[model samples]
Target: GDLWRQRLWIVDDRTAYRPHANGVIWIWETSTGRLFVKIVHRTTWAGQTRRAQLAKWKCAEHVLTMLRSQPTEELPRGIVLAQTASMDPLKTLLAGTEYAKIPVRAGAAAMPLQALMALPEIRDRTQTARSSELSIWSGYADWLEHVPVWIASARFLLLLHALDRAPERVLQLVWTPWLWPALPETDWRRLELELQ
Candidate 1:
């Protein structure tokens, strides 16, 4: 319970390289290994920028909005972002908003970065290109749909590794049925098999 009080959120943004840019939020709660993923697409870009910047702004804004509804006691202790030039604006945004009270830091060695390189799910997904000795882009089409699943799985394994918790224990906290009651039933057994 005390550890939950010390929970942190790792935030990042991914901008698609297409002519019409699209972005997705990479927000993860370290304690439960849960991802708060949201896509901010063209529809939300009324007064947009070099789309990438706008995308990053809206993605971070979504996380801040989600945090606003959280119980005060459940707020994250801090927010960590990757030390990329793109994230500087987010730091400024947080400072000007209600989240100013929360600490925000840029971590070059964030757990998610480290975890991505070591996740078996990632390794398994990338193996086709690895074995064929092709560039990563070669497998991009096939891997696109599974990105969320793999990213979520990577976060799960990283939590398990960092906390040395039983796999079941970690999943229990992550997939709490009460927290997601409105969603249609989830096939958690399949999820555990994929994540484990």
Candidate 2:
């Protein structure tokens, strides 16, 4: 697509190769042809472990999907593409400085302070804490400040339902046939019940 042709610029070359769990982000100036890149890395214990790479990929995919669904003003206008290659798990010991330089060679335009300000803050709360009534209310208020409160509340409930159901469904179907099988019916009723 014509939207994918614009070049990407990476800024803050220090975190580029730092084994980012959440993946990297950058802002490209469509009119002026400049890019401000931000490499979001994982600093938590889980992020440091090799086992969390798959989860990292999932998180990256989720964020990218959310970005793709937004209007141009909400997200960058150009196509958002992920690098095709996966990092070598064995070579996880690369220095942070060395890893940071790769994005520069990869064609990041320039670093911008504005881009840093736009990056999403990582939530440190656990599932139990997030599920608490007080914390949930506070979180709801926080989200409402950024988006329509009702829509935000609905989305939050939907996400909560999906999170609760996906794990159980995965567990139930673990012993099912691998090659091909009838499409299993999801417990949507149960999810709805959970909402109430």
Candidate 3:
């Protein structure tokens, strides 16, 4: 960890006013594509120290954090979560009363990244290789919307902005209704919450 540099823009966080604190003091700065990494201290977790991690990535990647997705709801799980961290997808939830749902300024009209990545042009360049393992995702991405029987959540546009660089990671199926997101005809929050 480059704590000795004495000149990274990282700020010591109180971490009291926020939800998502994945230890990124911001991508801080990107320089000629080279990055300096610094890690400090430990939480209550084991076998890992922030200092060791900083040395590994040299902060080339954003910071240490990862998560998986699903069909009904996004279950947060990853190295960051493993450290028992709580994160808000939209940086900070100001009101903190509930999840913020802000309306978008434009259409969901632009094709989603999953569909874009599925295009022959994109797939040819990006896909790892053909898989003997079949997936609903294997063929064309002609239809990105959900079928009539499916549902939608109040998942928001502001949420999309936070996913700017990597829409695929936030894009999930096994836990969300549609492959991407389409508006739900029904407001199922009240009813669905009652189910469990």
Q: Write the per-residue lDDT of candidate 3 for residues 53-97, one digit (tens) a residue.
A: 332232212232211112223211111111112223222321232
How should the candidates be ordered by TM-score, best one leading?
1, 2, 3
Weakest lDDT window of 10 consecutive positions for candidate 1: 132-141
Model 3 sits at a Cα RMSD from the real structure of: 18.9
Cα RMSD (Å) between model 1 and the true structure?
13.0
Which candidate's TM-score is highest? 1
In terms of lDDT, the poorest run of 10 residues in model 2 is: 128-137
For candidate 3, what is the total of clashing residue pairs? 8
Of the two candidates 1 and 3, the one with more favorable TM-score, higher being better, is 1
Please write out the lDDT profile of model 2 over residues 42-91, one tens digit for every residue.
43324344534643353344334434454555444332222322223211
By lDDT, the better pick of 1 and 3 is: 1
Judged by whole-model lDDT over C-alpha atoms, candidate 2 comes out at 0.31
Candidate 3 — which pairs collide?
20-87, 70-174, 70-175, 70-176, 71-174, 71-175, 71-176, 72-175
Residues 27-114 of candidate 1 have per-residue lDDT tens digits of: 6565555555343444455464676665556656665676776787878888777535445665666776666778777762344332
TM-scores of the candidates are 0.48, 0.24, 0.16
